[PDB]
Amino acid sequence: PSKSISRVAQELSKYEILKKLDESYSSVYLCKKKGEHKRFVCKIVKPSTFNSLEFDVHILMRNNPNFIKLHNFVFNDNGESLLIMDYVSDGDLFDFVKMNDTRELRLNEAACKKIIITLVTALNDLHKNNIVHNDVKLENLLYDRKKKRLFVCDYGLSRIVGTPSFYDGTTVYFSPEKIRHEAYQTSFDWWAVGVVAYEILSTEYPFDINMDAIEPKDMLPLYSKPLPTIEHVSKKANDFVRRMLALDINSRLSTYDEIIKHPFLCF
Amino acid sequence: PSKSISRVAQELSKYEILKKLDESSSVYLCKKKGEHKRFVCKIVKPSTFNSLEFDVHILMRNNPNFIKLHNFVFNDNGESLLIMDYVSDGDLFDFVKRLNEAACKKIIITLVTALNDLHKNNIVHNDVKLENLLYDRKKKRLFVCDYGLSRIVGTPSFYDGTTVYFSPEKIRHEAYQTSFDWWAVGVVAYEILSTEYPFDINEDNEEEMDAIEPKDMLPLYSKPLPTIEHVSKKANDFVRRMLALDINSRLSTYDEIIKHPFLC
Ligand SMILES: Nc1ncnc2c1ncn2[C@@H]1O[C@H](COP(=O)(O)O)[C@@H](O)[C@H]1O
Ligand SMILES: Nc1ncnc2c1ncn2[C@@H]1O[C@H](COP(=O)(O)O)[C@@H](O)[C@H]1O
């Protein structure tokens, strides 16, 4: 009606920037409507860098409590594009394993079990759409010890199942198959889940590294070495991460059903 | 900073609605301040937008046979907007209601190539038809349009789109797959080469085309395809194999299709 256009300019003119939240293709800011309380997150993406599938993940998972609702989104071919989303938490799983722990953050085995069940279930829900998250890692799993609610975030590297893969994302989370340029598949996400599970359970990275120069093929020798036992977690928890990170996919929990039926995740 | 919001709002404020484009989602012709180039602004109803429509636009940005998207505004509690190129005042349907074989061969090669490029993303258009193929008669240029029913390969299917373009496999509720698009291409190819619908129903009787159930298409595919009189034997062989009921007798893949003598 031509009021829509100016309403878009009117609505998205209410938002005011409070701070920069992140540390690049994108930058994330704390936002707020003038005179209104609720805090949002406004993500500004550079021109000619947007992964259109990031929009789909928000929409497809709108009704899943472990994904982040998208309130507004403006894409411009010849400029910046905006995503205005909920602010869900100040913390993430990396905060609970990092070396600088001034706030006495810890995740015991029970907390890891619950997080992993939620993560696996949430990623499975996404996978029903034949989309993979493709950058699952501690920094993209928001969590705080008051809500204790897990939010999967940053769908900017999401991909359609079956398409040719390339070396996007974080190398040290690459599955053997992604290193070998196999098509995007759910097993990519499940391997990253395995690394996350090892990290929150042990507070250490599974494989033998200290790193800007680490390359995908450098990971393969490391995957061939024994996975260290996590000393102070259960035998079931150890058996879980071993089978999550088996080099041979034919010995690995590489599917939803395999993962969710393992003793560790059962009660 | 906040300057980015101002600029983002500013860019979209340059567009002005000129007129609506139907007597029938609503599509409008739009103009931009400082451009003679026209655009198409498509306002989609809240709650019913297929997110993948946006992806097809973006993924096919550099393909000349898809429509370029310039802006997209989404509001979870409002109306969403797509601002895209205005490419043509008509489509292959309007244009068929006298294409010679050579002209049809070019259109088919272009369409098959364009759709193959889309299929590299494991996306299927899923509503290929004459009315969704815009055609600039001046430049003989083809544009695939209306990605509102696009789907990802391997997801379960339902009876969306246009029944009379449904493949045997879509009628049988197989998962979405490239062959859905290729069957529709076969119908398009038959239509432009012959000016007629291949199967034994009155395509000018609207009520009947709209009412026919998917299951009732399958007996029609059993019948032999009428020969197209004044086109090549190669052309006739092409449409015959594009629309073979038995998929083992059908050109159901890009490599199969593009290697047929008619397209060589
Ligand atoms: N919905 C959100 N709510 C709260 N913090 C967020 C949110 N999204 C991103 N952040 C923070 O901003 C950082 C960079 O954004 P991103 O990588 O896109 O998640 C994240 O690692 C979080 O620290
Ligand atoms: N770029 C365009 N140029 C001219 N007519 C269009 C254009 N886009 C859409 N239309 C008309 O609007 C319908 C649907 O809009 P669309 O979203 O572009 O598929 C088409 O089937 C045409 O009738």
Author numbering:
A (entry chain A): 3 to 25, 30 to 216, 223 to 279
B (entry chain B): 3 to 26, 32 to 104, 112 to 278
Which passages does the manuscript contain on this structure?
Phosphorylation of p6.9 is mediated by protein kinase-1 (PK-1), a protein kinase expressed within the nucleocapsid of lepidopteran-infecting baculoviruses. Here, we present the crystal structure of Cydia pomenella granulovirus PK-1: a serine/threonine protein kinase that, despite being encoded by the baculoviral genome, shares the fold of a eukaryotic protein kinase. Therefore, both the encapsulation and release of the baculoviral genome is regulated by the phosphorylation status of p6.9, thus supporting a pivotal role for post-translational modifications in the baculovirus life cycle. Phylogenetically, PK-1 appears to have originated from its host’s genome, with the greatest similarities to the AGC kinase domain of ribosomal protein S6 kinase A5 (RPS6KA5) homologues in arthropods.
